[PDB]
């Protein structure tokens, strides 16, 4: 069983990093994937790819060990850099949403609106507010509990748990987890909106001669649209219900349980280039780098 | 399968006026764009006029005032009225359908093409 679950750590980075790597391999070769939404994927593979390289690795043998092997300066930056692509990978998400809506249901107002030049803007802002709410209170110690025993872990070399007051944990869920997530939710949502209200006005066009069905390509877009939400909800919700839910109940919720949830989180990680990379253009880009 | 089946197309002299039309035949998603793009001998593929499933539009500098673009408001057909046609305007014209059906990318249906030629 924790043979089993050392087993599952290692697929799980091997599938992060292979994804993510050949992801950005295949937009960073190929002229016709260097688009504007590509460039926002761009910034969601870094994020990825930066979380299988380095934060579950660390993370995967604290669980194996059962100690921090590594010292209270790399345990304190560990966890500004966890918390730093947790941040960007959600948070470039929720941009995704928004350049997709804007492409699908205003394409022609987008193509003037979005340029590479204010791409670049929207994606330096996310990692500047994921190193702000990360490195920033992390390093400079105001993610820190005043409790004794909380100030036991932070004073044994040995232990990384991840014990905050209550405003740090609040705030760094909420700028990293929930307002993506009501974003997300109401974006795609006038993307459903949009879709069954021009299927409304097809039906008014026809002089009650026909009413539309949904055909093959609106169950295939609502399908995507529940894979999106799902996975994206799935993966992240639990940890960060979880997270809030420490801040006050401290005893409520089990460690193990805890640190799981945290582990599936990193799974979303994983599924992104399955995901947003399904286009005909990604496909052949995969084939061509992979001989 | 999707096809798109273009017709009116043909021989006119400047001055006249002709009107493309493109029935798509398949399954298209509700948010879409139907678009005629065109490649004049010797030169490479231009977009002459676009509308969305919404109604918004968008023209080339050189149509403008001139061709309007327009959609079947019960199918999946997009008509282009071209006035005051020029020689310049010869070209084959193709008709293209963007489907965003897939959400985050958006797939490609490219009509065979129809010749239009204008004579002085």
């Known amino acids: 069983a924790a043979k089993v679950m050392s087993l599952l750590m290692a697929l799980v980075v091997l599938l992060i990093v292979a994804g993510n790597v050949l992801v950005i391999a295949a937009i960073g070769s190929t002229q016709r994937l260097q688009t504007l939404t590509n460039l926002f994927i761009t910034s969601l593979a870094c994020a990825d790819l930066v979380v299988g390289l380095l934060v579950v690795p660390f993370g995967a043998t604290l669980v194996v060990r059962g100690t921090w092997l590594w010292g209270s300066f790399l345990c304190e930056l560990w966890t500004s850099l966890d918390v730093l692509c947790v941040t960007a990978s959600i948070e470039t998400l929720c941009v995704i949403a928004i350049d997709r809506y804007l492409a699908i249901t205003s394409p022609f107002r987008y193509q003037s609106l979005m340029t590479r030049a204010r791409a670049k803007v929207i994606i330096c802002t996310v990692w500047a507010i994921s190193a702000l709410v990360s490195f920033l209170p992390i390093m400079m110690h105001w993610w820190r509990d005043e409790d004794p025993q909380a100030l036991k872990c932070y004073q044994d070399p040995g232990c990384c748990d991840f014990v905050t007051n209550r405003a740090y944990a609040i705030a760094s869920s909420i700028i990293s987890f929930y307002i993506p997530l009501l974003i997300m939710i109401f974006v795609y949502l006038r993307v459903y909106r949009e879709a069954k209200e021009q299927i409304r006005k097809i039906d008014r066009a026809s002089k009650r001669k026909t009413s539309r069905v949904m055909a093959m390509k609106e169950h295939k877009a609502l399908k995507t649209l529940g894979i999106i939400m799902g996975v994206f909800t799935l993966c992240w919700l639990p940890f960060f219900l979880v997270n809030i839910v420490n801040v006050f109940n401290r005893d409520l919720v089990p460690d193990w349980l805890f640190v799981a949830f945290n582990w599936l989180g990193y799974a979303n990680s994983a599924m992104n280039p399955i995901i947003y990379c399904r286009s005909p253009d990604f496909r052949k880009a995969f084939k061509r780098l992979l001989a | 399968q999707v096809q798109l089946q273009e017709s009116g197309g043909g021989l006119v002299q400047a001055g006249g006026s002709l009107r493309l039309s493109c029935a798509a035949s398949?399954?298209?998603?509700?948010?879409?764009?139907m678009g005629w793009y065109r490649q004049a001998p010797g030169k490479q593929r231009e977009l002459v006029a676009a509308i969305h499933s919404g109604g918004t539009t968008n023209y080339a500098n050189s149509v403008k005032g001139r061709f309007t673009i327009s959609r079947d408001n019960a199918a999946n057909t997009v008509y282009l009225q071209m006035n005051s046609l020029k020689p310049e305007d010869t070209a084959v014209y193709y008709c293209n359908v963007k489907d965003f059906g897939a959400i985050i990318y958006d797939y490609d249906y490219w009509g065979q093409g129809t010749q239009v030629t204008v004579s002085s």
């Open positions: 398949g399954s298209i998603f509700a948010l879409n764009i």
